[PDB]
Amino acid sequence: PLLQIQPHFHVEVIEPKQVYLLGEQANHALTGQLYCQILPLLNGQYTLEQIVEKLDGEVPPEYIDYVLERLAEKGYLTEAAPELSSEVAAFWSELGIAPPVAAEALRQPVTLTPVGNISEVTVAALTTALRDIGISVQTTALNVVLTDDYLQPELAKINKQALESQQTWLLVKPVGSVLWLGPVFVPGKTGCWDCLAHRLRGNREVEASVLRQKQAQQGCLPTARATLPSTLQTGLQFAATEIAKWIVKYHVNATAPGTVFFPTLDGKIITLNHSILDLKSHILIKRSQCPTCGDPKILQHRGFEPLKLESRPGHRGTTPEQTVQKYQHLISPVTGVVTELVRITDPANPLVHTYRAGHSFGSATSLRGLRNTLKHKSSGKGKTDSQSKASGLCEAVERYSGIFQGDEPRKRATLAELGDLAIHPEQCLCFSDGQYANRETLNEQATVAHDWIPQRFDASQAIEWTPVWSLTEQTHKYLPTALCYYHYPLPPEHRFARGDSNGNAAGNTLEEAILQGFMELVERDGVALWWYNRLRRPAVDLGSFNEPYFVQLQQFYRENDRDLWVLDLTADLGIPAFAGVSNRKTGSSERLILGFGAHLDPTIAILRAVTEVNQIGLELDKVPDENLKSDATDWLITEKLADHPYLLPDTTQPLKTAQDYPKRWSDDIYTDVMTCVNIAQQAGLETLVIDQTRPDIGLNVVKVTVPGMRHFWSRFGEGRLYDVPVKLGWLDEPLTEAQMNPTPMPF
């Protein structure tokens, strides 16, 4: 029956041949003299037969159909719905939905289920808000859950039932200063509530910690206290609009699958902060390993399957901007893993680029431990703005992927029964028997936390071993899981390790990540041989490399009251490794700062070093010495260049140049890795890789380990730290443990 042009269009007629259709979101122009004649009869007040009568002796009715047909063909035309007001009709048409369809869709009913401390009156208000837009409640196609917190334990049960029942449902938190709205869970399609929750527990470490502390003295805390009746109503009503939108979208999709496009809260969480005023959209990822809906058993299989590398032709395979774009969605403090990614340095500086990235790992059982988490955040390093951004993002994801979740590849056994394939943790840690004997006294007095000494390994005890891949021998070996992931819970009487970040790296491909990891190892190994033997190294002529950034950067420091030079740390592997060093020429303290970097391309290696000097030292010079809460505070304030002659270059030796570093890289990242593994082999070293990648993340993350190679922390076990300097002729005879550098590497 009755016919109208889309009711969300104001219809304006310009007499000769022009009719303008004006929408809030869009505008249209109609050309034709007949359009002017007909369209004022398309207000929704006329029928074809009354249309044709009005113009009798004006237009041919045969023609009219041709207009109507073409308007209908182009989709400016619909049948008006008597059920709805013009405004309501207009809303759905602006989403591209016909009024008669909307009316039919809204007839559908919904359920409302409160959880936590949501009032029955609150539920009445939502019910009312739904009613006023023509939605009814059954006391279904959708279940709406009202909570005061997304981690209310009752939600776990509603979720499992919804999964077994295949019930689509929506979550909303309208109480509190921050409205949470969504997601709509659609079992078998959407992210899981538990898979959302997994993310959330990590993001609220402080809250998560308090409960741990609480149980010791012995699942969520109600912080949703700040609530105006206007914010509450703002959230219920807003939710009601989105509920309708889902219902309408769902209804049509059954009849005409994939025909509607406007977004719904399916897999999204919207947070509207009422206090500071900001609305953010948070994307929920369906975790393939979600115990509740996924298959947690995956990561086990993959660990015990071989590692298949395949060739991939600043070597990083794709642009930083591209890497950021696709992995941006992990930057959310709700659904995400990275809390933020913020430029810390001034943009007007085209040389210094440093990004802060918020970070979420902490199991701290005490306030003091809680201070240390939150404090320590990953960071971005780059020659350019774009490169720094990717570094900060990828480093944050790097650490998270390393955190022991509890589904990692493992098996319980002892060293003797594993035997040949098993690898003893003292081969990796390389602590001295003196250190292990004086743990409590040494650990008790330390200026640096990472210099912690674990309890000795007790080979008699069964432990969980994780299968690592050996690239040299092309088969599975085994390390104690405690070294392969962060925060592996060990018994209080067998804390023989703390998983470190050395060798850890992210990448757009496995080979890319493994490559960076191997270099990280070489970096540290190089620094260790240099620092704890206190060797005098040659400087690097930064002009001999076809890259001005070094030279410009040096000048920057001078203008900012500093000198910047670079030392050569290339050891027996022959892989370019360097240390960037800088001291302040005035002020209260000298503020010595260090940066390290290794790469087959020595230009990249130096660049890594110098940028890691920017990352660490530069922001702090703005601070008076009395405000420093850095872990390297004491170092920065009291230490001096004179007291550490192994920091400034040896004028006895000549400056290194670009021609002193042979090219051993190719056009392939896989070939580069295979080069590194064989360089390590000729030195008698095995190269191991564990795939820390997470399916719900995507970005590859690995930990590379090369047993024997040194960490730049104070670990004075027998091995390369003593021997390598002699084999190269840097020393005539090995130093003693008692002769190693008493001052820990502070960064």
């Binding site: 041949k17 505008n27 249209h28 122009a29 109609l30 050309t31 034709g32 073409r70």
Partner: peptide, 13 residues
Amino acid sequence: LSSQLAELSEEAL
């Protein structure tokens, strides 16, 4: 084909 009907066009601004 006709003129009055031919000149008819529709477009999104």
